[PDB]
């Protein structure tokens, strides 16, 4: 199917506790493959997936140089945006950046993106046409003019529709044994009595990849969005994901409720029902 | 591979 490569950058100022904390991570789909931490002793881009370890020394040299350079510019930008928003040097602030590319099954460019945040809110984003910017406020409009002058969009577009897609293709091939796998959800249902007249039905999906999954409860074949608890999809820590959905049902009405599981790995959607 | 064309905000 379709695949993505995404880089995430976080810079956090820490007044009177040294220069900003910088953490960079690289992902192919839901699999992390590189990290950099400004606080770590290595001061190198580090591998986090087996299949990136087959890149040569020139790869690690360039990635280390370019990730450090990104942290340096983001350090300057924290100072500039603090100026734009008339904020004290005494307060901590956060710049977050995400950029990357999507490809289809054929490995051809699908879309590119770059989004920038300040203190957890949209600051500036490259539009889908990769030619123009959306600035969130009057501070971001100054950045927009600077970025237009320096042809940021033109250079970023060449990266996103070229370099990004080329290296994503390369990573998908080298890591194909793990990246192009689909682990379907192992599914079961549990019954937990609350009182004499109530019980919890919990529908489980375990050990699945990728992360994207839909768990929904129906009563008499009718969607039950209300009286439902749906926890966020969570990592198992072994490269697979877990999720569950729960309904509070009257005692002796368990057979009325069905759980519906949709995942890439499943040939067709699974229907589960309580089995005493 | 990382993008290397760094423009200040």
């Amino acid at each position: 199917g379709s695949h993505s490569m995404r880089y995430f950058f976080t810079s956090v100022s820490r007044p009177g506790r040294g220069e900003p904390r910088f953490i960079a991570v690289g992902y192919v789909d839901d699999t992390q493959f590189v990290r950099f931490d400004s606080d770590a002793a290595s001061q190198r881009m580090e591998p986090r997936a087996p299949w990136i370890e087959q890149e040569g020394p020139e790869y690690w040299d360039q990635e280390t140089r370019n990730v450090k350079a990104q942290s340096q510019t983001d350090r300057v930008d924290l100072g500039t945006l603090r100026g734009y928003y008339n904020q004290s040097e005494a307060g901590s602030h956060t710049i977050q950046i995400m950029y990357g590319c999507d490809v289809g099954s054929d490995g051809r460019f699908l879309r590119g993106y770059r989004q920038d945040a300040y203190d957890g809110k949209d600051y500036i984003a490259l539009n889908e046409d990769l030619r123009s910017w959306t600035a969130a406020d009057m501070a971001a409009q100054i950045t927009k003019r600077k970025w237009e002058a320096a042809h940021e969009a033109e250079q970023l577009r060449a990266y996103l529709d070229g370099t990004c897609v080329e290296w994503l293709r390369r990573y998908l091939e080298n890591g194909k044994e793990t990246l192009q796998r689909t682990d379907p959800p192992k599914t079961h249902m549990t019954h937990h009595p609350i009182s004499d007249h109530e019980a919890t039905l919990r529908c489980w999906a375990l050990g699945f990849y990728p992360a994207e999954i839909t768990l929904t409860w129906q009563r008499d074949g009718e969607d039950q969005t209300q009286d439902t608890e749906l926890v966020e999809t969570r990592p198992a820590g072994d490269g697979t994901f877990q999720k569950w959905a729960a309904v509070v049902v009257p005692s002796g009405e368990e057979q009325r409720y069905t759980c519906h599981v949709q995942h890439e790995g499943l040939p067709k959607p699974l229907t589960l029902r309580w089995e005493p | 591979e990382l993008f290397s064309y760094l423009i200040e905000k």
Epitope: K68, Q72, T73, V76, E154, T163 | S4, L6, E8
Partner: T-cell receptor, first 114, second 112 residues
Framework: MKQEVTQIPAALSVPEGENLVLNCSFT??????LQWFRQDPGKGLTSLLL?????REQTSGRLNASLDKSSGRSTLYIAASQPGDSATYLC????????????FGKGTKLSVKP | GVTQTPKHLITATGQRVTLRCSPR?????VYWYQQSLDQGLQFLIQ???????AKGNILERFSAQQFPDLHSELNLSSLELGDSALYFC????????????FGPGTRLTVLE
């Protein structure tokens, strides 16, 4: 490939008023931009034109420059050359994936004779 | 804007010299270039906001730094005859991907 910038001719002595052609070739086509400088004794380098990888040409007064990235070629045209144009003309590129350092040709030593 | 001191240096082989550069007021980047007769202009090393950003084809006996005030020093040790060149400092308001403003250069002569 290893990026090498070469310029023809190495030197050019011409009478003023002539339209001049200064040639530049580079081995590797993966460049962010190509920049033309003039160098004068004891004054260092002054930028003439900056051509983006996406741009075909740039103009600045009597100066016009073309960029054929695939061919690895750039041409600087000096219209109605004046004695004040006398300098070393330097062709330089910046590599994609690098942090902006210039890779220089050895230059064309231009003498425009009054 | 970009100043370089000293303008001229005459020393013997094996000696050590320090080349000084001050960028344009407010500029963040400092680039060092060596212009010799054999290789022309060659990138040595570049700094951004007081930290090394990139290193060229530079020898171990060649070292440099950018100080908190963003002025830079280039140290050339165990000098050889082949080190005779014009040493240029260039500064940039940003990373230097678009603009590099060159100082007047420091001319070094190494003799027997």
């Amino acid at each position: 490939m290893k990026q090498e910038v070469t310029q023809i001719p190495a030197a050019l002595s011409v009478p003023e008023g002539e339209n001049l052609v200064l040639n530049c070739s580079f081995t590797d086509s993966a460049i962010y931009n190509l920049q033309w400088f003039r160098q004068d004794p004891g004054k260092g380098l002054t930028s003439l034109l900056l051509i983006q990888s996406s741009q075909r040409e740039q103009t600045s007064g009597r100066l016009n420059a073309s960029l054929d990235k695939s061919s690895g070629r750039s041409t600087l045209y000096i219209a109605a050359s004046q004695p004040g144009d006398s300098a070393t003309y330097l062709c330089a590129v910046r590599q994609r994936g690098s942090q902006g350092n210039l890779i220089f040709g050895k230059g064309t030593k231009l003498s425009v004779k009054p | 804007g970009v100043t370089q001191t000293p303008k001229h240096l005459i020393t013997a082989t094996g000696q050590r010299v320090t080349l000084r550069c001050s960028p344009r007021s407010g500029d963040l980047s400092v680039y060092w270039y060596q212009q010799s007769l054999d290789q022309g202009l060659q990138f040595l090393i570049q700094y951004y906001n007081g930290e090394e950003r990139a290193k060229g084809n530079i020898l171990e006996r060649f070292s440099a730094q950018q100080f908190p005030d963003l002025h830079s020093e280039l140290n050339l040790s165990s000098l050889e005859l082949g080190d005779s060149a014009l040493y240029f400092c260039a500064s940039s308001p940003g990373g230097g991907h678009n603009e590099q403003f060159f100082g007047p250069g420091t001319r070094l002569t190494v003799l027997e």
